[PDB]
Each structure stands twice: as C-alpha cells, then as structure tokens.
Amino acid sequence: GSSGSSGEKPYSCNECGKAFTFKSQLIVHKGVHTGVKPSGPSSG
C-alpha cells in the first residue's frame, strides 16, 4: 500500500480531492462526481 508521495500535477480535483499529471486522467476521476448516473444530465 505505497501511495502518497506526489511531485507536481497541474491537474487536481476539488470535489473529493486528488491530483493528476494529465487533464484526461482527471476527467475520468471526476466522472465519479459529475453525473453519478447514466441517465444523462440529471439537471438542465
């Protein structure tokens, strides 16, 4: 369980909190928050 050390990442989450080297990587992790259902955009 070696997880923690982090250098520098211009992409970090705000909802739950996290870091990412590339945007895409962050977009995927963000999907867990935004729209927690396949039922398209909850609101709009």
Ligand SMILES: [Zn+2]
């Ligand atoms: Zn997050």
